Structures are given as structure tokens and as C-alpha cells.
């Protein structure tokens, strides 16, 4: 259907410990397809998807070049950043970048992203129009000025409208069997006696893809939320996801409680109850 | 396909 390609990049300085840590992992939707990491981590035994492997060694050498090249920029970035914030050389600092493109069902661009954070706080973002920046603070304004003078938004718009889109299509074609699947959640509700008085009902959704899901408990149809204890959607580890929703119910009153799943790979939003098997 | 950053912050 519709898809997103996103890259998540990191540069963490490590004064007195070694050279900065440079990471760059790419996703199509919720599927990691490519990872670059200055910390090597195995003889190029680096989490590549099968449909990237089919791309030549030229693709791989070139992306590696861009990575090494990017680290170089990011070192300059780190240096300038601590100048802007008057921070000593002694501290460790993190630069992060997040970028990529959202395509529609017709493989054309819906939205382009490109934003930065310094020490886990937003720093600068390419606006939706891909022609302007929002600076989070005074320091980022120096970056913004520097970048409007150097026409960076234009360079980024070019990547987002051109290379990003075009390659995302190439990826989606080559990995259709993986990337176009939508695995519905396998669900069930379990009973967990707390006392004679009370019991936890737990509504489970396992094995789903993509990660986007909605797990809600309801009473007779009337919604909870304040009493529903969600857990954070979590990786199964087989490129699939899990989430559960729990609620505490007085004993005897189980049938009054309904679980409502809603997921992309589910033909119609489903209802579940407890059922003593 | 990775993006190129030619201009630092």
C-alpha cells in the first residue's frame, strides 16, 4: 500500500575513549533493511535484507562511501555544536538525524522528513515544504543561517523527492513478498486471579506487522483507558510485533469486558472476550 | 539508499 523509508543516524563523541560512534540504520516501514556502524560489528556481517543483497557490490561500496563521508561531516557538526553551546571537550555528546520519505500507494511522495537532535533534544528540522527550517533555539539559528546560505534545503529536497522515492520503489519492488505483507495479530485473552474479589484480564496481540495497532478494553461497549494498562508495543524478534492490554476486573464480572483490536492486516476490527477453555 | 551530508550543523 503506502510506505515510508526512514534513516536513523547517530554520532556520539567519546572523548578519551576512542573515536566517535557513528551509526546509520534504515527502515522501509517497520522493517530494518540496512545498517552502517563505525563500530564495524562483524565482517560486514551487517543486518542487510535479502533484497538489498541482490543489489550489486557497487550499491554497497557507494553507500559505504556516503556513510564514511557522513561521519566526517558529523565530526565537524559535533565540533561546531559544542562551540555553539560553550561545552568543554570533556563531555560526551550525541548528534542524531532522522530522514526519509513517505510515499503513497502510487509510489509518489506524500511527505519528506529531515530533522536533527542534539543530546536528545530537537535542534533543527526541515519544514514540510522542504524549503525552510525550524530552529529549536538560538544555537540552531546559527546552523539555520549557515544552511540557508549554503542552500542545504535544496540539497535535501533533491534527496527526498528524487533518490529516496526512486530507491524506495526499487526496494518495494524487490521485496514485495516481505514489504507488502500485513501479518494480522494472533489474539487471545487470559485470566489472572488476583484474589477472591478480583482478577486481571489480559488481552494479547502477537505476531503482527506493521507495528501500528490499537488494543482497548471496554465495559459492555463503554470504553476504559484510565484503568487499561497498556504495555509498549515490542519486537517478537522475527520481524514481527507484540502488544498486550490488561485490566483488573471484580470476580464474576468477566463477560462484561470486551477487548478491541484494530490492525492494518485485520479485515475488520475484532472483538474478544475471556473464554474458560 | 543513504543520503549525503555535505554541510555540517
Amino acid at each position, epitope marked *: 500500500g503506502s510506505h515510508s523509508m526512514r534513516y536513523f543516524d547517530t554520532a556520539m563523541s567519546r572523548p578519551g575513549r576512542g573515536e566517535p560512534r557513528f551509526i546509520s540504520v534504515g527502515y522501509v516501514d517497520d522493517t530494518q533493511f540496512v545498517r552502517f556502524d563505525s563500530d564495524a560489528a562483524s565482517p560486514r556481517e551487517e543486518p542487510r535484507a535479502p533484497w538489498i543483497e541482490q543489489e550489486g557490490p557497487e550499491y554497497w561500496d*557507494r553507500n559505504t562511501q*556516503i556513510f564514511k*563521508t557522513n561521519t566526517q*561531516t558529523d565530526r565537524e557538526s559535533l565540533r561546531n555544536l559544542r562551540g555553539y553551546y560553550n561545552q568543554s571537550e570533556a563531555g560526551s555528546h550525541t548528534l542524531q538525524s532522522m530522514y526519509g520519505c513517505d510515499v503513497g500507494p502510487d509510489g509518489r511522495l506524500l511527505r519528506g522528513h529531515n530533522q536533527y537532535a542534539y543530546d536528545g533534544k530537537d535542534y533543527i528540522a526541515l519544514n514540510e515544504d522542504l524549503r525552510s527550517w525550524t530552529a529549536a533555539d538560538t544555537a540552531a539559528q546559527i546552523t539555520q543561517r549557515k544552511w540557508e546560505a549554503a*542552500r542545504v534545503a*535544496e*540539497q535535501d529536497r*533533491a*534527496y527526498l523527492e528524487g533518490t529516496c522515492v*526512486e530507491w524506495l520503489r526499487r526496494y518495494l519492488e524487490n521485496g514485495k513478498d516481505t514489504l507488502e505483507r500485513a501479518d494480522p495479530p494472533k489474539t487471545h485473552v487470559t485470566h489472572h486471579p488476583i484474589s477472591d474479589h478480583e482478577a486481571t484480564l489480559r488481552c494479547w496481540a502477537l505476531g503482527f506487522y506493521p507495528a501500528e495497532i490499537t488494543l482497548t478494553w471496554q465495559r459492555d461497549g463503554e470504553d476504559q483507558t484510565q484503568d487499561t494498562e497498556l504495555v509498549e508495543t515490542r519486537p517478537a524478534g522475527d520481524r514481527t510485533f507484540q502488544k498486550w492490554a490488561a485490566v483488573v476486573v471484580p470476580s464474576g464480572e468477566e463477560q462484561r469486558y470486551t477487548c478491541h483490536v484494530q490492525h492494518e492486516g485485520l479485515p475488520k476490527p475484532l472483538t474478544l472476550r475471556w473464554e474458560p477453555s | 539508499f543513504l543520503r549525503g551530508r555535505a554541510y555540517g550543523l
Partner: T-cell receptor
Amino acid sequence: MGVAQSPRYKIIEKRQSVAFWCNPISGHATLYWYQQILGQGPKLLIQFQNNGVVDDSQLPKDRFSAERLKGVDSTLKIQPAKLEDSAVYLCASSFTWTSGGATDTQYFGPGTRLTVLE
Amino acid sequence: KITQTQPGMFVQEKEAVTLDCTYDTSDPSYGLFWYKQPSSGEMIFVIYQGSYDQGNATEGRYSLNFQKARKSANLVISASQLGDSAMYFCAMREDTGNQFYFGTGTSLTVIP
């Protein structure tokens, strides 16, 4: 402005050395050195992003070298020159090199004509 | 790989010319660039085409007849002047590649 280069012409005896200077369009982060043999198009020697190398796979091993110490001003050097080095040495600058858009386009300098004589 | 064949090329003044150029890429995204080199061999950039831009590239009297399926990017010089000679170079930038690949170049002499 424009991409500036020095000198325009140079005569060298075989085995001697040459330096070529190049000044990119002010603020261009990318800087390329090309060799143009008579009858051919320019063929990339080495490419710089700011002060760092992007690609030098085609820099003739250990006769050719290049610095761009401060990611502005750049210098190409040939130590032992061979006659075969007689060519025009064009440098060029651009904003970017993998944007995949117009900012990739390379603007060349006037070039230096090198003639290596016996 | 750029292939601009024709050893040389002639045209009448005020007439239009097509300088042939067929590339070989396999990449989904790439760019094509035309450059002219007069006597006093300065490399002047003339026209850019991205494999993905919608309408064909136009710049002054220069025009890029870009045909993606046949993989050709002929330069179209219209209303030709005498100052259009000039060797002309066709160059491809492909995402996967590591340089502008320049062709051997076609020289265009403009007959008055």
C-alpha cells in the same frame, strides 16, 4: 568568483614536479580534480568533501597527490612527472555530489595546460 | 558508460543540431549533464536532467531530448551560432557510481 586555477600553462622537464592550485566557488563543499588527455573527456582524479577525500581511486598511485587542507583552497601535485602527464588539469566545484539534483552539477575552472617535455 | 558516437558533426548557422548520447546505467535514479568545451578549453556546464524530473530539461537554446526507455539524452541546440564550437561532452552521474562519466566528446563545427 568562478572556479579559479593557477597557473594556466606550465612546462616541466620529465621527472620534475608540478603543483596545481584551484579555488572553488566560494562556499562549495565539494571539489574535484580532473585530467583531460588530448582527444578525451575529463576523467576524475580525486574528489573532496570539505577537507576530506570522497574518492581517489583514480589518483595515479605514487606520482599524483592532492590536499585541500581547510576544505577551501586545493592543490594537486605530480612528483616524478612522466611525459604521459601532458594534459589539461581541470578542477571543479559543486555544492554536493550525491544529492541527485541540480546542486550536484560541477562548475569547472579554466584548467592548467601541462606540457611535459623530454 | 556514455556512448556519444559520430566522430564530428556539422550544422548550418541558425539551424538546429542534435548531438547523440546513449548511456548505460541500470540504476533507478541518476542524472545527465551536458558540457561544452571551446578552443581555450574551459568546461562550461550547459544542461542537467535528473532521471526522475517530469518535463524534459530546457535551458536557453539548449534542450535535452531525454528518452528513458531508449536510454538516450541527446542535446538539442537550436538557432545555432558560430560560437557553438565547442567540443561537447555528455556526462552521467549515477547514484551507484563514483564519478561523472564523461563521453569521448563530439565536436560540432558551425558552417556559416
